[PDB]
Symmetry: D7
Subunit: 125 residues, 14 copies
């Protein structure tokens, strides 16, 4: 159970590494094509598919560090998991200085032909 | 036919959960939730809460009619015994000034079928 | 020759919109239901940015809530024989908390469809 | 029964497709294209019209003539088919754009459009946008 | 000749005074006799819209039933005679009234009224008040 | 028959009002003067609550003031005898702002018109913000 | 003597006028004011008002009070005309129960008809 | 007769304002009684006397137009009048644009040796 | 030498204390005996104007919770045999609306003139 | 003799203010008693004594004109060698925005004549 | 072992908070070292020492539930531990309604004669 | 006497720790902290953070003089290899306006001795 | 070292007794512990230095509800055999309008002088 | 009061020297006049009592900035508390030049306690409040 849970934390880390690298091919590989999301940038709408996130990758030398804090993982049958965590982001600001911000994040994962894939997520500030 | 019907099952169970909440029926809420339920919600102030302890206080200590609408639900079937559902939760209620108002929340619920009965294992509400 | 009917057909839509508003102001949900398509979709300030569908959402307002409405400057488009839409400023005259008469306004669009001879509202969009 | 569902699914796509073409004309600043897709007696409610119902193309022309990548998403569209030659469509219009601070932002509008088919080509006869 | 003009202008001032008196007395019947049935108005209460007919004003008469005294002064009126059966009048309308705190206050409005003589009786066809 | 005519007479007033505004937007005081009665009275925001009389007041604005479009919205015209009319409309102005961008503003506007020697002339107006 | 005394006459009549006002005696006020009095005052909201109509409402529809005419300057402008400029201090009791003072700049123009001085114009500003 | 005598006062008031707008202190001095008294916003609530106070404004202070609006003139004996009017000033602002402002203004006039002179004035914003 | 200056200065402080005591007691007759009939004053209640005589103050006595005054840090100048002035912070201890004790302060100058053996206040200036 | 004696005090007060406006500390020092006491807004509620406090203002405060008007002065003669004067002090000056402005103060000055020359022993200014 | 030893500290921290919520000063005193030092919002930025300061609260102060959230315990030798956790308090508000609030809280524990005792604590809002 | 010197030991090590932070020296800081250090601090926004990951970013991405004062330190000795220390941390620093300024924090640190070296196992800063 | 320590305790003890006098509202006790020429800086004196007992009396007489004071982190200097000063944070725990317990604080300095065996407060400085 | 007046001047003089050391940014001089165990209350210490010289050094070392300053000790009251001890309380006016280029005054209430060691008066404690 502990190692299976690690698997989900590992894949969630890989996903976030994709986002911080600004790598949409990597992000597209890890997400189900019909991924749905709630997030602050969606302004209260449920968005669906990759269309919406693309714009953020395409139009995004400043260092960033993410911390997945206090992750709790439920295994929900053999090919299904979800993971809930605080996402700390450390970044550099306009005043030139280091700063941290946070988000609550839920992600639901589904395993297709051996690869885990993100089918939904919910971020809130 | 089948995917449509399986999805309805999740919407139906989500509707029953909300109805337990709106009726303040903790016993019913308990039956529908996994005992190790984890939650993110505004009232938990940024923390992930675990189990039933936290919610009990709300039931125990909270005539004004109320209506909930599950709006625009999207359901993912994630294997035979697992689903999640995402929707806008509209709540219609009566305000202090005596008048009807609506508010909203984004809400995600993850569901797991144990012994034939679907159960909520996690949820995430945001204002 | 050809206008006589256009003017009259347009009045039909203004008249039916006036009946709808009168149902609302009378709090007559049964009447409102008869005039609305059961799959009515709405944009409105109370729905907080969401598109709502059906009657569920409006029922609450009827069940749990003098006044004059003016349909101002209505423009009607006839869009085939069994379809129209109407756009107007909806003035509402009402009495305020301080005891006094006040007017407020909304921009409002309604789309109408004629089924079995009776016009019915299929969609509306109100903005403050 | 069954067969009407598909009929209806395709007809509705036709409206979504045409609405997509309209928005693309707008985002491209192509007034000629916009003009071909709009009925000449188009009526509009929109924030820029400050509470008034505007009529015709006069009012919009100024925006095209006198106005940083952009993406629009038609979100959650609902289409009503209102007889053979008439439809309306209601959706959230998300716009992704680049801000003054150099950064990507999203904004939204509720939008209703009423469509009428003349000589085989769908045309926009009315719209209502609210912030 | 200057006498003729002076008297004709007084007629308009007099009729405007009667109208305002009707309004202050809350006499809708009187107000209706003095106004053309297709009266158009611009006023603060109409929130930027041009209102037409009597419908809009009726609500104010029917539901503003207010004991407390009021005096109106038509200040600095200018009258244009625009043909034999038409005039307009422009003036500052001072209203003296009693306030919530119990005390006397004065407020003002700029006001334009256009008058048309039908069957010997002058009638108000349009007005424009601004705060 | 009788409605087409009222319709045409009303257009005449809308046309002349459009010509006036065009004179204003072009800053053509001579044209403005020809269209206004020399004893024009005005209420307007720039007059700060006072009724101004004649051309003196407006001249300063012409003499001392990017693209502009005016729309006369929802005009209602009353015909008040053969030689007299008034018109009430929302005046939308589209213009370019300090930030470089296109903006619209509005005013409620009433104009009273008198026909002298065949030519309609503005005898009074009232604009409010 | 002569100039000093003539000036006092104007200050005295101004004092009588203010006293009429403070007593709410409209008949007295009317006797002292020319029927075509013109006024600028804060209650007239920026407009010049004419005649007695406007002031009547205040008398008809309006706790001790004291007025002080402070630092009056009088110009004698021919035999039958003067004007007087002064700060008008008003001492009064407030809502909170307490004594307060307020002030106004005030100009009055006076004309003598049939031996009796009358106020033809005034200008008060806060 | 009354109409003409009144015009005389309006004309002289117009000449005074023109002196002011031209910044011509000599002219202003010829038109004002040397013991002129004034109430005005710049005098901050005090009654000022003589020319001293105004001189500073002329000496140390862009087209301008004044309009004497709605003047009422009282004739107060043969050698005395007062005039009350709204003084509209049209001017150019900091932002480059034309603006109007207003003042209530009272002036009292006295005729000495045939020439009308200003003995008092009261301006309020 | 300084014993006599010290004593003369006390005389002015003593008379100032008597004046304030008259004021706090609301004794206008006393106040009138201690003040020159042509007293001039600057004070916050006179709103920026210099007031003259007794008229202005009378209203306060006639129409106006224990109180204590402290004359703090007084400096006295002896300006000839029959003239002095005194400058001090005037602390007032009083009871407030909320029922509680509060202190407030004023800067205060008083000029004194001796007529027929009795010191009299000819001018004062208070500022908040 | 009263009118003339009073003028003497107004004249000397005018000289003092002129010394101030010229920034002439030596002049100011000659006209002031060395034990001058003052109340003024810049002294923040404290009574200041001597010349120390004022010196800083002279030493560190240009090419922008100024006019003072002693308005409505009242002078009390308080014995042969003592007077006080109370007036509104109007100051006309040029502001940051480039324009002429007037400001005011209530001002009291007490004067004492030593060896034939009047000297200021105390003053009180309030805004 | 480590899991059980840590529980012992969580259990004792739970007993302390229960003493507080019951307003049982005698119980609180038994669990605290007499030389307890504290940082807390009510001490206004000062480090308080002993029981004097807290006694006033017990003596002079509606259901309530506390949750010790996400506790981390360090075992620092055999007779010493510290515990850090989010303290959630559920309570009833003035408006009649249930509310939750939170505090970050650190406690340092020392075992004397077999009984664990609180020697220091730090709460921050 | 003994107790006083053992207490000094903890104050000394806390001073060394803070010197490390102000020098921006992460190797020094890593030496003095237990690898499983937990912290509460304002920058962690209300979360309890664990290990060195979080603080690294602040060292790597941070010539302005700084002085820290450990004020009124109280130290408890909690068995032979365990201590904690609680103090006000005054930081004197230079601001944007170019000027010297002081700020403060309440700080708690728990210390554990492993093979002779004292190591910080937890800390809690609050503003 | 027990001596310096105990002499310092003496000053803390007397400072406690002084504050107990204040909280008991006992002006005779307070007057006994203060030198008659005591000077003070305190918020209620609004930025002036006050002198003697006059000023404080008003507060005792008109201060007519449990309170607890804590002298926190006192530092005491002994400044010759009959002189000391003490500096401390004065925490006050009290009950508020909303009915609830609250704490407030002040920085406080007191200078003490021994006259015929009794220590007496000659000066103090409180600031918020 | 011949000796009392003079003894009090001694304390006012030494306070004036201290302030002059401060205004000159002379830490060595400040150090000679202060007891090494000086305790202070002051606004910059944010509510804490600070001890020793450590805290004040930073201000001297890092506050330079041809910009004149005058201090006035106003209305000083001095208590003589035995032969080797005094305290002094006064309003400290500071005249200085502001950002806008202009002269301004500010004030503080200030108490200082003095102790004579080996003939030289030294400051053992002070309390400033805004």
């Amino acid at each position: 159970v502990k190692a299976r849970k690690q698997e989900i934390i590992k894949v969630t880390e890989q996903l976030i590494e994709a986002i911080n690298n600004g790598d949409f091919e990597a992000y597209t590989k890890i997400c189900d094509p019909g991924l749905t999301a709630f997030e602050p940038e969606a302004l209260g709408n449920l968005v669906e598919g990759m269309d919406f996130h693309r714009f953020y990758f395409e139009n995004a030398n400043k260092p960033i560090h993410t911390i997945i804090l206090n992750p709790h993982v439920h295994l929900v049958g053999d090919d299904a998991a979800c993971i809930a965590y605080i996402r700390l982001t450390q970044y550099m600001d306009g005043s030139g200085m280091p700063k941290t911000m946070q988000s609550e994040e839920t992600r639901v994962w589904h395993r297709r032909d051996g690869k885990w894939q993100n089918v939904h997520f919910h971020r809130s500030g």
